[PDB]
């Protein structure tokens, strides 16, 4: 019920108006998702991102309550920090850490990453994933669009609007929530998937970092999902250009057999990650991608 949704949100949020804590509001996006701003925390000077949503036109509000509750209780260095929230009448404000370097998509579409830079990004993402999975949280929409980058080369996962909380009683999910091109084949071929769907998606992201797009991007998402299910592990355009250790890492992320596919904990030990450059090595790519827009 709409009234119970509001009462639940009232309990979660900080009291009063967000304008009593945040100052220099500047709009950076608007849609059906709501309006997104950057702003400054009056007390700390911190630059923040603020999502403003009208609840009278938010169609799946249980998802927002879930998102806030999950983020609040699963803080991690490699996850964009949930900071606070406010509710004014029908208007919900969600205050987040802001990263000014844009998304990994901007980087992969505008620049050419080397293996050391790719390894650094994969490592940071797997750190977030190992934490979430150990906490029985599946992200379920891992893709370059959802990796935000700091000007210092920090790498952080965002958008928990699609995540799942699992239990030993119900350790597998069946809902198709992910973006088609990044979806593991078992999401469509079976009705029981687990945390390793995020590992598959990470593998596809590594393909983005190599080739600039996930496999089948040019195809209708409906066709892509059939292709994923029937082709299985995607083929690289030029696998000879990659190191043997990177090819091995990709093989372990994109294994068809879920049991054989690496977990996040296992993949954190992979020798591909050991060639990682410092995160500072990403800064020129981030600067270049930001300029290119």
Domain locations along the chain: 1-98, 99-293
Domain 1-98 CATH superfamily: Phosphorylase Kinase; domain 1 (3.30.200.20)
Of 28, 11, 4, the residue nearest 85 (C-alpha): 11
Q: Which of 84, 141, 152, 159 is catalytic?
A: 141
Decide: helix, strand or coil at residue 5: helix
Distance CA(10)–CA(92), nearest Å, equals: 10
Q: How far is CA 178 from CA 61, 113, 174, 224, 225, in A?
A: 18, 25, 11, 13, 11
210-216 CB contacts, 8 Å cutoff, 24+ apart? 210/113, 210/118, 210/236, 210/242, 211/236, 211/237, 212/108, 212/109, 214/143, 214/181, 214/182, 215/181, 216/181
Distance CA(146)–CA(177), nearest Å, equals: 14
Q: Cβ(206)–Cβ(253) under 8 Å?
A: yes
- Reported as type and span, the H/E element at residue 251 is helix 244-253
Method: X-ray
99-293: in CATH 1.10.510.10: yes
Annotation marks residue 114 as catalytic: no
């Amino acid at each position: 019920s709409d009234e119970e949704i509001l009462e639940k949100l009232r309990s979660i949020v900080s009291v009063g108006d967000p304008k009593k804590k945040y100052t220099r509001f500047e709009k950076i996006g608007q849609g059906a998702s709501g309006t997104v701003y950057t702003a400054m925390d009056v007390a700390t000077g911190q630059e923040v991102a603020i999502r403003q949503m009208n609840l009278q036109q938010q169609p799946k509000k249980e998802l927002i309550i879930n998102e806030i509750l999950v983020m609040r209780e699963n803080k991690n260095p490699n996850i964009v920090n949930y900071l606070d929230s406010y509710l004014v009448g029908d208007e919900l404000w969600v205050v987040m850490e802001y990263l000014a370097g844009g998304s990994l998509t901007d980087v992969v579409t505008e620049t050419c990453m080397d293996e050391g830079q790719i390894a650094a990004v994969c490592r940071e993402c797997l750190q977030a994933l190992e934490f979430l999975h150990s906490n029985q949280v599946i992200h379920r929409d891992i893709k370059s669009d959802n990796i935000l980058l700091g000007m210092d080369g920090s790498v952080k996962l965002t958008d928990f609007g699609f995540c799942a909380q699992i239990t030993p009683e119900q350790s597998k999910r069946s809902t198709m929530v992910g973006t088609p091109y990044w979806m593991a084949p078992e999401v469509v071929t079976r009705k029981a998937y687990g945390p390793k769907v995020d590992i598959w998606s990470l593998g596809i992201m590594a393909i983005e970092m190599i080739e600039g797009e996930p496999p089948y991007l040019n195809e209708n998402p409906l066709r892509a999902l059939y292709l994923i299910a029937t082709n299985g592990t995607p083929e690289l355009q030029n696998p000879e250009k990659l190191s043997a250790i990177f090819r091995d890492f990709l093989n372990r992320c994109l294994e068809m057999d879920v049991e054989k596919r690496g977990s996040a904990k296992e993949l954190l030990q992979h020798q591909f990650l050991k060639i990682a450059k410092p995160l500072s090595s990403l800064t020129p790519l981030i600067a270049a991608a930001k300029e290119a827009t």
